[PDB]
């Protein structure tokens, strides 16, 4: 049996552990944190994520989708909250088969850990990777106290997240060609209780947005009707706009309350613990990191956030990481050798990771925001009705299909240009030649 060591019992690492172990690989998975399945007297994490077709299909192949979906809340569409305007649901898809799912992060991780162990993987917690000696095929791990443990390895999978220690170790033997693009927004997680969401009639089966241009809030529902709210706001005010809101200006919880009361007046009343959440929850960092190299020969490979940190504005990081896990297990299982598998995995996935990194950055303006937009949207709707196998909105290709991300981006660009051009020099739809637009659709977009 082929042997593998995986660092990081997160989402990608645990899924690839199950896929490899059920294929008979001898799998050892090392995780820095304690086992979340061991109940303690500490409060659980209320962090949630959007699960879409890419992630769901990966779980489906693993035999875990039904268990995960049992505690997921359907989000049928986007509920936009702008003061004055009553909220009205904007469906994401054609019917309830085209929805996204809000799931608790910790619950997803527990289901994945049980799945990896059921398939035969051995999981070792409270062990953080510190260093790798590639030439001697050994690695060093340690607990929080620095007590060290050395292990021999044969194949190393870095599934250890955006600040990957495997990635840092690879940088000692290969030039990874790393390009970091910092994101100016930080984020803060806040809570809406079940009592508060019910009192204010907040729709449970939707993804909620409070757009505000350079900043915004989103809220994803939980099974118990609580919601996890995330504020996206610049860490610092840029030199050009010193008066612009930023985390730097919010010196404490009371300042955060005044800011919410002024900028998000319909949201502030639902945030009962705003002051405490603001002071006790750390402000998170966002970034895009692009690597030219994801592997060291046949010895080590990165996947998920370890390989391609992205901004979260499309809710695709976990979805992409699970898709990566399926691809890596498929390549490893059937390749001539590990070196061939890692090179083929990297060549296949890199263009797709670049595409979702670009589309995630673009989705910020789509969420945080015109008569031109409405006309383009209406025209796009007619084209989708006339040609459902050719004109598929980019959001649907990314979220409800398994089309390679690079193809979703390429077709999305064709559609965006087609609409932009067709609406240019037009006041309304009545002056637009729909057949000429449809001719462009049949000419430029092959049926899927």
Binding site listing: 11-12, 31-33, 50, 78, 92, 105, 129, 305, 318-319, 363, 395
Taking the least distance from each CB to ligand 8RK, the nearer of 58 and 123 is: 58
Residue 361's Cα: distance from chain center in Å?
Answer: 12
186 near ligand FAD, rule: CB under 6 A? no
Q: Calculate the dihedral angle through the C-alpha atoms of 21, 27, 28, 29, rounding to the nearest 10 degrees.
A: -50
Distance CA 229, CA 221 (A): 9
Distance CA 316, CA 339 (A): 28
Query: Among residue numbers 16 through 35, which ones bind ligand FAD (CB under 6 A)?
Result: 30-33
Taking the least distance from each CB to ligand FAD, the nearer of 9 and 20 is: 9
312 near Cl ion, rule: CB under 5 A? yes
329 near ligand FAD, rule: CB under 6 A? no
In the three-class reduction of DSSP (H, G, I as helix; E, B as strand; rest coil), residue 326 is classed as helix
Q: Report the length, in residues, of the chain.
A: 448
Distances (CA, A) of 163 to 127, 168, 313, 357: 16, 8, 19, 17
Minimum separation from the CB atom of position 287 to Cl ion (A): 12
Instruction: Give helix then strand counts, H and E, for the chain.
Output: 14, 20
36 near ligand FAD, rule: CB under 6 A? no
Residue 225's binding partner, choosing from ligand FAD, Cl ion, ligand 8RK, none, with beta-carbon cut-off 5 to 8 A by kind?
none
159 near ligand FAD, rule: CB under 6 A? yes
Binding residues for FAD are 11-12, 31-33, 50, 105, 129, 305, 318-319
CB 64 within 8 A of CB 111: yes
Q: Segment contacting Cl ion (CB under 5 A): 199-207, 310-318, 388-396, 434-442?
A: 310-318
Residue 193's Cα: distance from chain center in Å?
Answer: 24
Please count the other Cβ atoms lying within 10 Å of the Cβ belonging to residue 374.
11
Binding test (CB under 6 A) with ligand FAD, winner from 245, 312, 380, 393? 312
CB 210 within 8 A of CB 231: no
Sign for the pseudo-dihedral over CA of 407, 306, 61, 99:
negative
128 near ligand FAD, rule: CB under 6 A? yes
Residue 352's binding partner, choosing from Cl ion, ligand 8RK, ligand FAD, none, with beta-carbon cut-off 5 to 8 A by kind?
none
Minimum separation from the CB atom of position 235 to ligand FAD (A): 14
> Could you tell me the two tokens for 91?
């469906």
158 near ligand FAD, rule: CB under 6 A? no
| Residue 50: HSE in the Cβ half-sphere, 13 Å Cα cutoff | 25
Minimum separation from the CB atom of position 392 to Cl ion (A): 21
Per-position DSSP letters for 78-93, written without gaps between them: EEE-BTTBPP-EEESS
Specify the residue for token string 């489906």: 60
Minimum separation from the CB atom of position 95 to ligand FAD (A): 22
CB 321 within 8 A of CB 9: no
Minimum separation from the CB atom of position 314 to Cl ion (A): 6
Q: Segment contacting Cl ion (CB under 5 A): 155-163, 176-184, 309-317, 418-426?
A: 309-317
In the three-class reduction of DSSP (H, G, I as helix; E, B as strand; rest coil), residue 72 is classed as coil
129 near ligand FAD, rule: CB under 6 A? yes
Binding site for ligand 8RK (CB under 6 A): 50, 78, 100, 207, 218, 312-315, 363, 366-367
161 near ligand FAD, rule: CB under 6 A? yes
Contacting positions for ligand FAD (CB under 6 A) = 7-13, 30-33, 49-50, 128-129, 159-161, 165, 187, 230, 284, 304-306, 312, 315-319, 321
> Applying CB under 5 A, which residues contact Cl ion?
312, 317
């Amino acid at each position: 049996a082929r042997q593998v060591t995986i660092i990081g019992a997160g989402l990608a690492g645990t899924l690839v552990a199950r896929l490899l172990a059920r294929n008979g690989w001898q799998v050892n998975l090392f995780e820095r944190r304690p086992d979340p399945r061991i109940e303690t007297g500490a409060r659980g994490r209320s962090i949630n994520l959007a699960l879409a077709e890419r992630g769901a299909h990966a779980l489906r192949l693993a035999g875990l989708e039904r268990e995960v979906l049992a505690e997921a809340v359907m989000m049928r569409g986007r509920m936009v909250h702008v003061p004055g305007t009553p909220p009205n649901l904007q469906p994401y898809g054609r019917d309830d088969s085209e929805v996204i799912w809000s799931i608790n992060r910790d619950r997803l991780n527990r289901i994945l850990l049980d799945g990896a162990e059921a398939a035969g993987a051995s999981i070792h917690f409270n062990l953080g990777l510190d260093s790798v000696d590639f030439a001697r095929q050994r690695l060093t791990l340690s607990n929080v106290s620095g007590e060290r443990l050395e292990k021999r390895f044969h194949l190393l999978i870095g599934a250890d997240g955006c600040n990957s220690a495997v990635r840092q170790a690879m940088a000692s033997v290969v030039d990874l060609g790393e390009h970091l693009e910092t994101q100016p927004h930080g984020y803060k997680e806040l809570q809406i209780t079940p009592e508060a969401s019910a009192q204010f009639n907040l729709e449970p089966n939707a993804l909620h947005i409070w757009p505000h241009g350079d900043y915004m809030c989103i809220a994803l529902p939980n099974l118990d009707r609580s919601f996890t709210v995330t504020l996206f706001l610049h860490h610092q005010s840029p030199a050009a706009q010193p008066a612009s809101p930023s985390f730097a200006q919010l010196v404490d919880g009371h300042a955060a309350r005044r800011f919410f009361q002024r900028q998000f007046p319909d949201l502030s009343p639902m945030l009962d613990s705003l002051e405490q959440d603001f002071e006790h929850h750390p402000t998170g960092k966002l970034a895009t990191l692009r690597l030219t190299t994801w592997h060291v020969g046949g010895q080590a490979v990165l996947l998920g956030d370890a390989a391609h940190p992205m901004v979260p504005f499309h809710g695709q990081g976990m979805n992409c990481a699970l898709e990566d896990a399926v691809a890596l297990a498929e390549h490893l299982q059937s390749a001539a050798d590990n070196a061939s598998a890692l090179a083929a995995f990297t060549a296949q996935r890199q263009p797709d990771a670049l595409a979702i990194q670009a589309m995630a950055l673009e989705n910020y303006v789509e969420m945080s925001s015109s008569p031109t937009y409405l006309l383009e949207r209406e025209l796009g709707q007619i084209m989708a009705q006339r040609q459902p196998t050719r004109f598929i909105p980019r959001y649907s290709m990314v979220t409800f299909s398994r089309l390679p991300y690079a193809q979703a981006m390429a077709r999305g660009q064709i559609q965006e240009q087609l609409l932009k051009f067709a609406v240019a020099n037009h006041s309304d739809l009545t002056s637009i030649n729909l057949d000429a637009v449809e001719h462009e659709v049949t000419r430029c977009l092959p049926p899927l």
